[PDB]
Write a protein that binds this ligand. Structure first.
Ligand code: CLA
Ligand code: CLA
Ligand code: CLA
Ligand code: CLA
Ligand code: CLA
Ligand code: CLA
Ligand code: CLA
Ligand code: CLA
Ligand code: CLA
Ligand SMILES: CC1=C(/C=C/C(C)=C/C=C/C(C)=C/C=C/C=C(C)/C=C/C=C(C)/C=C/C2=C(C)CCCC2(C)C)C(C)(C)CCC1
Ligand code: SF4
Lengths: 86, 80, 220, 143, 31, 74, 145, 408, 29, 159
C-alpha cells in the first residue's frame, strides 16, 4: 500500500503511457521505401510552409480569376432591366 | 507574487494569522503594544490574494494590507 | 411634446454628469477606502470585507456612465428623427398629437416605421433592403450577447474550465497535443470591458440599420 | 536547534477507492505536495478532493496538488480529530522542502527566533502620493 | 474588370492567414 | 442629412466621457497636494460632498416629475 | 522576455492573461518598463505622426473609389434625380436574385449608395470631373508618405 | 430521508414540477370540461400558467438539494455508497454534459442562422425547409400513425382514438368554431423541438454543476465551511465571484425563464396557425393566421415579423376600449424589466459612497437618522435584480397573450 | 444600529433550521 | 470482483479505470492505430492518417456544397477537400514549429504502464513532427485524388 518513492518519480507522479506500442513496423519494406523516397521533399518544416502558402495563394487566385458565369452568379451579372427608385 | 505589508497600528490579536488559508503570516515578539507581539509576512510568494486577512483586522483601518501584483501559478490557484 | 422631451434630455445630461463627477472627485479616496490612490486607476475590488466593495475603483464609474450616455443620445436622436420624418411626410400633426404620451412613441414611431425594414426578405423574395434587415438582427444578437458578460461573473467559468482541462487531458488520440499557456477565465475588469463593447456595438448597429432603412425606404 | 523531520516514503497511505480529482500534468512537470500525520485509531474523514476515505492506524501519507488542500486537511484534522500534522513540497528533480510548521511552533504562537519581514513603522495614512514615485520604479508602499 | 476578382479573395483569405500565422509564431516565441 | 446628425452626436458623448475619465486619471496620478495648496483645485477637492449631493437633488427632481407627467398622460 | 517586451510582469505569466493584457496595455506608455519623460514625449510625437498618416490614407480611398466605380459625372448633371454610388460589390456568396436587386443607379453591377454626403461637398467646393478626384487621391497619398 | 427535511423537500418539488408540466400538456389535447376547447382565451391561459409553476418548482428542487448537500451531509454517521460514487467522478459527469450543450446549441441554432443567411442572399433553394432540404421528424409521425391505428386492432374495446391530434381522425366543430383536429408535423417542428432540448440541457447543466460542486472544488477546497449562501472568496486566484450554490440557482433561474418562454410561443403560434379557426356552413376551415407557421417559422426574421410584430397590434391599439388595462400593463412591465438592470450590472461600493455624500447633506441640517443607512449587500443586490427581471418578462408576455387572444 | 438588520429580519423568517437545532421543534413548526 | 478500479492501483491520480478505458478489446484496438506505434518511422505513420482523412473529407463537400445539383459537383467537392487538407497541413506545421525546439530530446513518457522502461516516442521531436506533417500532406492529397478517381471518373454504381 505504498505509492510514494524518491528514487522512482516516474511511478510516483503517474508518468506512464497507456496505449503505446513497441512492436516493429508492420508495413512492407518495398512500400515503405517507396513512400520514404517520394515523400522526402516535404519533410523540411521551413520550406513546406512557404510552399504551401505560395501554392495555395496562386491556386486560389488562378481559380477565382478565370471562373465563368455558369458557376458564380456574380460573374454573370444582372440580366433584368433596372427599376427606378422613389 | 502579491505584496503584503504590516503597519505599526497592530494590536496583536492573532486573527489574521488564523484566517490565512495558505500559511503566509506569523507572529513575532514586539514591545510596542500591550500584547507584546506583532504580525509578519515572510512567505508572500504563497499568497493567493483572497484578502481573508483584511476581513479580520479590527482596527479603524487595516493594519495588514494586500496589494495585487504579478500573478504566477501559485497565486492563480491552478492545479493543471 | 418638445417641452417634455427637452426635460428628459436635461435629466439625462444631469445624471451622466453626476456619475462622472462623483467618480472623478472620489477617485483619490473616500470613507470606505481612504487609501484608494495607492491601488491605481483600475482595480477589481477590495474584497468582500466591510460589507462588500464591488465596483469601487474610479474606472468603474466611467463604465457605468457609458450606459447613461448611450441612453441620452438615443433619446436625442429618437426625438430628432421622429420630428423630421413627420415634417417630411407632410403630416406634422401626428407628432404634435402623439408625442405627449408614451404609447404614441412605441406605436406611431417604432412599430409603424419598421414595417418596410423587416420585409427585406420574406418567404416570397427579397429586395435591396435585405442587408439592413440582416444588420438589424446582427445588432440585436450582439446586444443580447453583451448581457452574458455583464451579468454572470467569473467564479463559475473557472470551475467549468477545470473540468474541461481534465477532460481534454484524459482523452485518447487527443492528449498527444498540448497547450503552451494554461487556459484561464477572463479577469474581473476584462469582462466588464468586453460586455460594454458588445452592448455599444449592438446598440449602434441596430439603430443605424433602423434609421437608414426607414428613411431611405420612402424617400430614397 | 530545530532540525526538520525527515520524510519516510514507506509510510502507508489511507484507504481510498480512487477519484478524478487527483494529480495532473502539473505534478509531473512542476511540483506536488505531501502531507503526513498520525492516527490513534482507524476512522473516516472527508477528502479535500471529493469523497470519503479511511485513515489507517499509525502513520499516514497523502499526496495533494496544492498547498491550500494540505492546509485545509491539516486544519480539519487539528480542529476535529486533535492530530498533529506536517506537510512538504516535492520537485520533479527529487528534492523535498519542509514547509509547515517551519519553526516547530504554530504561526499563531509567538517565538523569539523569528524575524520581522515586511513591517512598516507608520500608519497606513502616512504613505506618499503616487506623484513622488513617478519614473523611479518603486511603489508608495514599498518605501 | 477582373481586379475585384483578383483582390477581394486575396485580402479576404490569403493575407489574414499569413498575418495570423506570423502573429501566432511571434507571441509564442520564447527565449 | 439624418445620418450626419446621428453620426456626429454619438461621437460627442464618447469624447465627453473620455474628458471626464482623463480628469479622474489626472487626479489619481499627477496631482500633488503640496504644490496646489489652497488654490481653486484644492478647494474643489475640499467640498466634494456639497457638489455631489446637489446634482443628486437635480436629477431626482427632474426624473420624478418627468416620469410622473408622462405616466399621467398615458 | 518574449511578449509583451515592454512589461516584465506580464511576460512571466504562464496563463492566457498574458496575451490579453499585452494587447490592452500597449499604448499606456507611462506604465512600461524603464520609461522616462523624454522617451514618453518622443513616443507621443511619433504616435501623433502615425495617426496623421492614417487620416490622409482613409480620405484617399473614398476619392479613388468614387472616381473609379461611382457616377459623379452623371450625378452632377441632374443632382436631384440620381443616386450617389459609394463603391462596387463583389461577393461570391451572392445569389442571382441579389445581383439584380442591388444593381441600381447607372451602374452595370451591384453597388452601394453613398449616405456620407461627399458628392454634395465635392460639388460645392468646385470639383466637376473624375480627373480632379484622381488628382486629389494622388496628392493625399503623397501627404501620407 | 427520515432525518432531513431538505432532501424530502427537494424530491417532492421535483416530482410536483414534472407532474404540473404533464398536467399542462395533457389538458389542451383532451379537453375534460364542456365548452372549453372552443373557448380559446381560457385554453391559452391554462397552458401558460402551469408551465411557469412547474419550472419554478423544479428550480426549487435544485436549490434545496444544494442546501442539503451543504448542511446535512455527513459521511461519518450517515454514509451512503451511491452518493459517494457520484461525488467521486463528478469531473466526468459535468464535462460530458458540457459537450452535449455545445453540440445541441450549434446544430439547433446554426440551422436557423444558415436559413436566415440563405434567405438574405437570395438563395431559397439552400435552406432547411419543406421545399429545399427536408429534415422530417419521422419517429413522431410513426408514433402518430400507430396511435391513430391502435383502436380496432390493439384496443378492441375502444370506439375512437384517445385524442384527435393523431392524424386519421375527424374534425370536431362546436358552434361554428374548431375544437380539435389532427396536428401536422414538418421541418418547422424538427428545429423547435431541438431548441427545447438544448435549453433544457443547459439548465440541467447549471443546476447539476452547482449541486455537485456545492461542497468543494479544485479552486476553493474549504467551500463547505463558507456556507450555502456567500458572495465570493475575494479577488484572489484571479477572481472568485459567484462560486456558491445560491449563485448557481440564481444563474439557473434566468435559463429556466429563457426555456419556458420559447415553449409558450411555440404553442401559441402553432395552435393559432394550424388548429384554431372557424368553419363555414359548407365545411371550409379558415385558421386565425392562415397556416403561416410552416414557412415563416424557419428563420429568425419570421418570428420577429410574423409573430412579434404582427400579433402585437392588438395590445398597442387597446387604448380607449375595455381592454386598455392590458395596454397599460404592457408598458408598465417593460419599465420593471429595464429597471432590473440597474442592480444586475452595478456594484456595491459606488452606492455606498453616494449614500455617504447624501448622509453628509442630511447631517448638515440635523436630520441624520440614528439608524445608519447602508447599501444593499452583495447577495441582496443579485436577488433584487432577478426578481424584477422575471416579473417584467412574465407580465409583458401575460398582457400580450391576454390582449391578443380575447380580441380575436 | 444599521439598516441591514431590517432586510435580514425578513430574509430568515422561515428558516427554522437556523433558529433551533432540535428536529422536534422544526417538525412542529 | 470490481470492474471499476483506480489506475495502475494508485487511487491518488486524477483518472479511473473503467470498462470503456482499460478493457482488453479496446486497448488492443487503440494500441494498433498509427498514432500509437512508437517504434515506427513518423513518416510512415503520417501517410496512413493523411490517406484516411483525405478519403473521408471528399464526400461532405461533394454532396452538400453549393454546386451539388449541377455537373461541377464532383470536381468542386474534391477541390474543396484538397484546400481543407492544405489548410490542415499548414496548421500542423505551425504547431510543430511553435511547440518543439531543435536539438532537444523527446518529452513523451518513457515508462510502460507495467513499469517497464521503453525508448520515448520520437514524434515529440522537431524532426519527427516535420516528417509526420510531410507524410500527412502527401497522404491527404493522394487520398482525395483517389476518392475523386474512384467516384467520378469510373462512374461506379454507388448508392
Ligand atoms: C471574406 C472572404 C471570403 C471569401 C472571398 C470567401 C469565398 C468563398 N466562400 Mg466563404 N466564408 C468566409 C469568408 C470568405 N469566403 C467566412 C468569414 C465564413 C465564415 C462565416 C465563410 C463560410 C463559408 C461557407 C460555409 C462556405 C463558403 C464558400 C465559399 C465559396 C463560394 C462557393 C464557391 O466558390 O464554390 C466553388 C468552390 C471551389 C471551386 C473550391 C474552393 C476554391 C479553391 C480552388 C480552393 C483551394 C484554394 C487553396 C488551394 C486553398 C486555400 C489557400 C489558402 C492560402 C487560403 C467562395 C470561394 C462555400 C464553398 O463552397 O466553400 C467550400 C461554402 O460552403 N464560405
Ligand atoms: C444572446 C446572448 C447569448 C448567447 C449567444 C449565449 C450563448 C451561450 N451561452 Mg449564455 N447567457 C446569456 C446570453 C447568451 N449566451 C445570458 C444573458 C446569461 C445570463 C448571465 C447567460 C448564461 C449562461 C450560462 C450560465 C451558461 C451559458 C452558456 C452558453 C453557451 C452554451 C453552449 C454552446 O456552445 O452553445 C452553442 C453556441 C451558440 C448557439 C452560439 C453560436 C451561434 C452561431 C452558430 C455562431 C457561429 C459563428 C461561426 C463560428 C462563424 C464565425 C467565424 C468568425 C471568423 C466570424 C453558448 C455559447 C453555457 C456554457 O458555458 O456552455 C456550456 C453556460 O453554462 N450562458
Ligand atoms: C483606407 C482606404 C481604403 C479602404 C477602406 C479601401 C477599401 C476597399 N478597397 Mg481599396 N484602395 C485604396 C484604399 C482603400 N480601399 C487605395 C489607396 C488604393 C490604391 C489606389 C486602392 C485600390 C483598390 C483596388 C484596385 C481594389 C480595391 C478594393 C477595395 C474593396 C475590397 C477590399 C480590397 O481588396 O482591398 C484591397 C486594397 C488595396 C490593395 C489597397 C491597399 C493600400 C474595399 C471596399 C477592391 C474592390 O473594389 O473590390 C470590389 C479592388 O479591386 N481597392
Ligand atoms: C485623443 C484621444 C485619446 C487618447 C490619446 C487617449 C489615450 C489614452 N487613454 Mg483614453 N479615452 C478616450 C480618448 C483618448 N485616450 C476617450 C474618448 C475615452 C472614453 C471612451 C477614453 C477612455 C479611456 C479609459 C477608460 C482608459 C483610457 C486609457 C488611456 C491610456 C492608455 C490607452 C490604452 O491602454 O489603450 C490601449 C488600447 C486598447 C485597450 C484597445 C481598446 C479597443 C476597444 C476595446 C474597442 C476598439 C492612453 C494615454 C487607459 C488609462 O490611462 O489607464 C490608466 C484607461 O483605462 N482611455
Ligand atoms: C428603466 C431602468 C432604470 C430606471 C428607472 C433608473 C432610475 C434611476 N437611476 Mg439608473 N441605471 C439603469 C437603469 C435605470 N435607472 C441602468 C441600466 C444603469 C447602468 C448599470 C443605471 C445606472 C445608474 C447610476 C450609476 C445612477 C443611477 C441613478 C438613478 C436614479 C436617478 C434618476 C432619477 O431622477 O430618479 C427618478 C426616480 C425614479 C425613476 C423612481 C420611480 C419609482 C416610483 C416613484 C415608485 C412608486 C411607488 C412604488 C410603485 C410603490 C411600491 C409598491 C410595491 C409593490 C413595491 C433613478 C432612480 C442615480 C442615483 O441613484 O442617484 C440619484 C445614479 O447615480 N442609475
Ligand atoms: C408628478 C406627477 C403628477 C402630477 C403633477 C399629477 C397631477 C394631477 N393628477 Mg395625476 N397621476 C400621476 C402623476 C401626476 N399627476 C401618475 C403617475 C398617475 C398614475 C397612477 C396619475 C393618475 C391620475 C388620475 C387617475 C387622476 C390624476 C389627476 C390629476 C390632477 C388632480 C387634480 C385634483 O383636483 O387633484 C392633477 C393635475 C386627476 C384628474 O382629474 O386630472 C385632471 C385624476 O383623476 N392623476
Ligand atoms: C414548498 C415550497 C417551498 C418551501 C417550503 C421553501 C422553504 C424555504 N426556502 Mg425555498 N424555494 C422554493 C420553494 C420552497 N421553499 C422554490 C420553488 C424555489 C425556486 C425559486 C426556492 C428557492 C429558494 C432559495 C434561493 C432559498 C430558499 C430558502 C428557503 C428557506 C428559507 C425561506 C425564507 O426565509 O423565505 C423568506 C421569504 C421571503 C424572502 C419572501 C420572498 C418574497 C418574494 C420573492 C417576492 C414576491 C413579490 C410579490 C409577487 C409582490 C408583492 C408586493 C407586496 C410586497 C406589496 C425555507 C426552508 C433559502 C434558504 O434555505 O437559504 C438557506 C434560500 O436562500 N428557497
Ligand atoms: C422627514 C425626513 C426627511 C427630511 C427632512 C429629508 C430632507 C432632505 N432630503 Mg431626504 N430622505 C428621507 C427623509 C428625509 N429627507 C428618507 C426617508 C429617504 C430614503 C427614501 C431620503 C432620501 C433622500 C435622497 C436620496 C436625497 C435626499 C435629499 C434630501 C434633501 C433635499 C430636499 C428634499 O426633499 O430631497 C428630496 C427627498 C426625498 C425625495 C425623500 C423622500 C421623502 C420621504 C419619503 C419622506 C419620509 C418622511 C418620514 C416618514 C418622516 C416620519 C416623521 C414621523 C416620525 C412623524 C433634504 C435636506 C437629497 C439631497 O440633497 O441629498 C442628501 C437626495 O439626493 N433624501
Ligand atoms: C451547425 C449548423 C450548420 C450546419 C449543419 C450547416 C450546414 C451547411 N452549410 Mg452553413 N452556416 C451556418 C451553420 C450551419 N451550416 C451558419 C451559422 C452560417 C452563418 C455564418 C452558415 C453559412 C453558410 C454559407 C454562407 C453556406 C453554408 C453552406 C452549408 C452547406 C455546405 C457546408 C459544407 O461544405 O459542409 C462542410 C462539411 C464538412 C467539411 C465535414 C462535416 C462532417 C461532419 C463533421 C461529420 C463528422 C462527425 C462524425 C459523425 C464523427 C464520427 C466519430 C468517429 C469516432 C467515427 C451545409 C448544408 C453552403 C451552401 O451552399 O449550402 C447549401 C454555403 O454557401 N452555410
Ligand atoms: C455670446 C452669446 C451667447 C453666449 C453664450 C455662452 C457664453 C455660453 C457658454 C457656455 C459654457 C461656458 C459652457 C461650458 C462647458 C463646460 C464643460 C464642458 C466642462 C467640462 C469639464 C471637464 C471635462 C473637466 C475635467 C477635469 C476634471 C474633472 C478634473 C481635473 C481637471 C480637468 C479639467 C481635466 C449666447 C448663446 C447667450 C447668446 C448669443 C451670443
Ligand atoms: S467583484 Fe466579486 S470578489 Fe470582488 S467584491 Fe464583488 S463579489 Fe467580491
Amino acid at each position: 500500500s505504498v505509492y510514494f518513492d524518491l528514487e522512482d518519480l516516474g511511478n510516483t507522479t503517474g508518468q506512464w503511457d497507456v496505449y503505446g506500442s513497441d512492436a516493429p513496423s508492420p508495413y512492407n519494406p518495398l512500400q515503405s521505401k517507396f513512400f520514404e523516397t517520394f515523400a522526402a521533399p516535404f519533410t523540411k518544416r521551413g520550406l513546406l510552409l512557404k510552399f504551401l502558402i505560395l501554392g495555395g495563394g496562386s491556386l486560389l487566385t488562378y481559380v477565382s480569376a478565370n471562373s465563368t458565369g455558369d458557376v458564380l452568379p456574380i460573374k454573370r451579372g444582372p440580366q433584368e432591366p433596372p427599376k427606378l427608385g422613389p | 507574487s502579491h505584496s503584503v505589508k504590516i503597519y505599526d497600528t497592530c494590536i496583536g490579536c492573532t486573527q489574521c494569522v488564523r484566517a490565512c488559508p495558505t500559511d503566509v503570516l506569523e507572529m513575532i515578539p514586539w514591545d510596542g503594544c500591550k500584547a507584546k507581539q506583532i504580525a509578519s509576512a515572510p512567505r508572500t510568494e504563497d499568497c493567493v490574494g483572497c484578502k481573508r486577512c483584511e476581513s479580520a483586522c479590527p482596527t479603524d483601518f487595516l493594519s495588514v494590507r494586500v496589494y495585487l501584483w504579478h500573478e504566477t501559478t501559485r497565486s492563480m490557484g491552478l492545479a493543471y | 411634446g418638445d417641452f417634455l422631451v427637452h426635460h428628459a434630455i436635461a435629466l439625462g445630461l444631469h445624471t451622466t454628469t453626476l456619475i462622472l463627477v462623483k467618480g472623478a472627485l472620489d477617485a483619490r479616496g473616500s470613507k470606505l477606502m481612504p487609501d484608494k490612490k495607492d491601488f491605481g486607476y483600475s482595480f477589481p475590488c477590495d474584497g468582500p470585507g466591510r460589507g462588500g466593495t464591488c465596483d469601487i475603483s474610479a474606472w468603474d464609474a466611467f463604465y457605468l456612465a457609458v450606459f447613461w450616455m448611450l441612453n441620452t443620445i438615443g433619446w436625442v436622436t429618437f426625438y430628432w428623427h421622429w420630428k423630421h420624418i413627420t415634417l417630411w411626410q407632410g403630416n406634422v400633426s401626428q407628432f404634435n398629437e402623439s408625442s405627449t404620451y408614451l404609447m404614441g412613441w412605441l406605436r406611431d414611431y417604432l412599430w409603424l416605421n419598421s414595417s418596410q425594414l423587416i420585409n427585406g426578405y420574406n418567404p416570397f423574395g427579397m429586395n435591396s433592403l435585405s442587408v439592413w434587415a440582416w444588420m438589424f438582427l446582427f445588432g440585436h444578437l450582439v446586444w443580447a450577447t453583451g448581457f452574458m458578460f455583464l451579468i454572470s461573473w467569473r467564479g463559475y467559468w473557472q470551475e467549468l474550465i477545470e473540468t474541461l482541462a481534465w477532460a481534454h487531458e484524459r482523452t485518447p488520440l487527443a492528449n498527444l497535443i498540448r497547450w503552451k499557456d494554461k487556459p484561464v477565465a477572463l479577469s474581473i475588469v476584462q469582462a466588464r470591458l468586453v460586455g460594454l463593447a458588445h452592448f455599444s456595438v449592438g446598440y449602434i448597429f441596430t439603430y443605424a440599420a433602423f434609421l437608414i432603412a426607414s428613411t431611405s425606404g420612402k424617400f430614397g | 536547534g530545530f532540525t526538520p523531520p525527515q520524510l519516510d516514503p514507506n509510510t502507508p497511505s489511507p484507504i481510498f477507492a480512487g477519484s478524478t480529482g487527483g494529480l495532473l500534468r502539473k505534478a509531473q512537470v512542476e511540483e506536488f505536495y505531501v502531507i503526513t500525520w498520525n492516527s490513534p485509531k482507524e476512522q473516516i474523514f472527508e477528502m479535500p478532493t471529493g469523497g470519503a476515505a479511511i485513515m489507517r492506524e499509525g502513520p499516514n501519507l497523502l499526496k495533494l496538488a496544492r498547498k491550500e488542500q494540505c492546509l485545509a486537511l491539516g486544519t480539519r484534522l487539528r480542529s476535529k480529530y486533535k492530530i498533529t500534522y506536517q506537510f512538504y513540497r516535492v520537485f520533479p528533480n527529487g528534492e523535498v522542502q519542509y514547509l509547515h510548521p517551519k519553526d516547530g511552533v504554530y504561526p499563531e504562537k509567538a517565538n523569539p527566533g523569528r524575524e520581522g519581514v515586511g513591517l512598516n513603522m507608520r500608519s497606513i495614512g502616512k504613505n506618499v502620493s503616487p506623484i513622488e514615485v513617478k519614473f523611479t520604479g518603486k511603489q508608495s508602499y514599498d518605501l | 474588370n477582373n481586379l475585384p476578382s483578383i483582390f477581394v479573395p486575396l485580402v479576404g483569405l490569403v493575407f489574414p492567414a499569413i498575418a495570423m500565422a506570423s502573429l501566432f509564431l511571434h507571441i509564442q516565441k520564447n527565449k | 442629412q439624418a445620418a450626419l446628425y446621428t453620426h456626429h452626436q454619438y461621437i460627442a458623448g464618447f469624447i465627453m466621457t473620455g474628458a471626464f475619465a482623463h480628469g479622474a486619471i489626472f487626479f489619481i496620478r499627477d496631482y500633488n497636494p503640496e504644490q496646489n495648496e489652497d488654490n481653486v483645485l484644492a478647494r474643489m477637492l475640499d467640498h466634494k460632498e456639497a457638489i455631489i449631493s446637489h446634482l443628486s437633488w437635480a436629477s431626482l427632481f427632474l426624473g420624478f416629475h418627468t416620469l410622473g407627467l408622462y405616466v399621467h398622460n398615458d | 522576455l518574449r511578449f509583451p517586451r515592454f512589461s516584465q510582469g506580464l511576460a512571466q505569466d504562464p496563463t492566457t492573461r498574458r496575451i490579453w493584457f499585452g494587447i490592452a496595455t500597449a499604448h499606456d506608455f507611462e506604465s512600461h518598463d524603464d520609461i522616462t519623460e523624454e522617451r514618453l514625449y518622443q513616443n507621443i510625437f511619433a504616435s501623433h505622426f502615425g495617426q496623421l498618416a492614417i487620416i490622409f490614407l482613409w480620405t484617399s480611398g473614398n476619392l479613388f473609389h468614387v472616381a473609379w466605380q461611382g457616377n459623379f459625372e452623371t450625378w452632377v448633371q441632374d443632382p436631384l434625380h440620381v443616386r450617389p454610388i459609394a463603391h462596387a460589390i463583389w461577393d461570391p456568396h451572392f445569389g442571382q436574385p441579389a445581383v439584380e436587386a442591388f444593381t441600381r443607379g447607372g451602374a452595370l453591377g451591384p453597388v452601394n449608395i453613398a449616405y456620407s454626403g461627399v458628392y454634395q461637398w465635392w460639388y460645392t467646393i468646385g470639383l466637376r470631373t473624375n480627373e480632379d478626384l484622381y488628382t486629389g487621391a494622388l496628392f493625399l497619398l503623397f501627404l501620407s508618405a | 430521508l427520515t432525518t432531513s427535511w431538505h432532501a424530502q423537500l427537494s424530491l417532492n418539488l421535483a416530482m410536483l414540477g414534472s407532474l404540473t408540466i404533464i398536467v399542462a400538456h395533457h389538458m389542451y389535447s383532451m379537453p375534460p370540461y364542456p365548452y372549453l376547447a372552443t373557448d380559446y382565451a381560457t385554453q391559452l391561459s391554462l397552458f401558460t400558467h402551469h408551465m411557469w409553476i412547474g419550472g419554478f418548482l423544479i428550480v426549487g428542487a435544485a436549490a434545496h438539494a444544494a442546501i442539503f448537500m451543504v448542511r446535512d451531509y455527513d459521511p461519518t454517521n450517515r454514509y451512503n455508497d451511491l452518493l459517494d460514487r457520484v461525488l467521486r467522478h463528478r469531473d466526468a459527469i459535468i464535462s460530458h454534459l458540457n459537450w452535449v450543450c455545445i453540440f445541441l446549441g450549434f446544430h439547433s441554432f446554426g440551422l436557423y442562422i444558415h436559413n436566415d443567411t440563405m434567405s438574405a442572399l437570395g438563395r431559397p433553394q439552400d435552406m432547411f425547409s419543406d421545399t429545399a432540404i427536408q429534415l422530417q421528424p419521422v419517429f413522431a409521425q410513426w408514433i402518430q400513425n400507430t396511435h391513430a391505428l391502435a383502436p380496432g386492432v390493439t384496443a378492441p374495446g375502444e370506439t375512437a382514438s384517445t385524442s384527435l391530434t393523431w392524424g386519421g381522425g375527424e374534425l370536431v366543430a362546436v358552434g361554428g368554431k374548431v375544437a380539435l383536429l389532427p396536428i401536422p408535423l414538418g421541418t418547422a417542428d424538427f428545429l423547435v423541438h431541438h431548441i427545447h432540448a438544448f435549453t433544457i440541457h443547459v439548465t440541467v447543466l447549471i443546476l447539476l454543476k452547482g449541486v455537485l460542486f456545492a461542497r468543494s472544488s479544485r479552486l476553493i477546497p474549504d467551500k463547505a465551511n463558507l456556507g450555502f449562501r456567500f458572495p465570493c472568496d475575494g479577488p484572489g486566484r484571479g477572481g472568485t465571484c459567484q462560486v456558491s450554490a445560491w449563485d448557481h440557482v440564481f444563474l439557473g433561474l434566468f435559463w429556466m425563464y429563457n426555456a419556458i418562454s420559447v415553449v409558450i410561443f411555440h404553442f401559441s403560434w402553432k395552435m393559432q396557425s394550424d388548429v384554431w379557426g372557424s368553419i363555414s356552413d359548407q365545411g371550409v376551415v379558415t385558421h386565425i393566421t392562415g397556416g403561416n407557421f410552416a414557412q415563416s417559422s424557419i428563420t429568425i426574421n419570421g418570428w420577429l415579423r410574423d409573430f412579434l410584430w404582427a400579433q402585437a397590434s392588438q395590445v398597442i391599439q387597446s387604448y380607449g376600449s375595455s381592454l386598455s388595462a392590458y395596454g397599460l400593463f404592457f408598458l408598465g412591465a417593460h419599465f420593471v424589466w429595464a429597471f432590473s438592470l440597474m442592480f444586475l450590472f452595478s456594484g456595491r461600493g459606488y452606492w455606498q459612497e453616494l449614500i455617504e455624500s447624501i448622509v453628509w447633506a442630511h447631517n448638515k441640517l440635523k436630520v441624520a437618522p440614528a439608524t445608519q443607512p447602508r447599501a444593499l449587500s452583495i447577495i441582496q443586490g443579485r436577488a433584487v435584480g432577478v426578481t424584477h427581471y422575471l416579473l417584467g418578462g412574465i407580465a409583458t408576455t401575460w398582457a400580450f397573450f391576454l390582449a391578443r387572444i380575447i380580441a380575436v | 444600529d444599521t439598516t441591514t438588520w431590517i432586510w435580514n429580519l425578513h430574509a430568515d423568517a422561515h428558516d427554522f433550521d437556523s433558529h433551533t437545532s432540535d428536529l422536534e421543534e422544526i417538525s412542529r413548526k | 470482483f470490481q470492474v471499476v478500479q483506480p489506475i495502475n492501483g494508485d487511487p491518488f491520480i486524477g483518472s479511473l479505470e473503467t470498462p470503456v478505458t482499460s478493457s482488453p478489446l479496446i486497448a488492443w484496438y487503440l494500441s494498433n492505430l498509427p498514432g500509437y506505434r512508437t517504434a515506427v518511422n513518423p513518416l510512415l505513420r503520417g501517410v496512413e492518417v493523411g490517406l484516411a482523412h483525405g478519403f473521408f473529407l471528399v464526400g461532405p463537400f461533394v454532396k452538400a456544397g453549393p454546386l451539388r445539383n449541377t455537373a461541377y459537383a464532383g470536381s468542386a467537392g474534391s477541390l474543396a477537400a484538397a484546400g481543407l487538407v492544405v489548410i490542415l497541413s499548414m496548421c500542423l506545421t505551425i504547431y510543430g514549429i511553435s511547440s518543439f525546439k531543435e536539438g532537444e530530446p523527446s518529452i513523451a513518457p518513457s515508462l510502460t504502464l507495467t513499469g517497464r522502461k521503453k525508448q520515448p516516442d520520437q514524434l515529440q521531436t522537431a524532426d519527427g513532427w516535420a516528417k509526420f506533417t510531410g507524410g500527412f500532406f502527401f497522404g491527404g492529397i493522394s487520398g482525395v485524388t483517389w476518392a475523386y478517381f474512384l467516384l467520378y471518373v469510373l462512374d461506379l454504381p454507388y448508392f
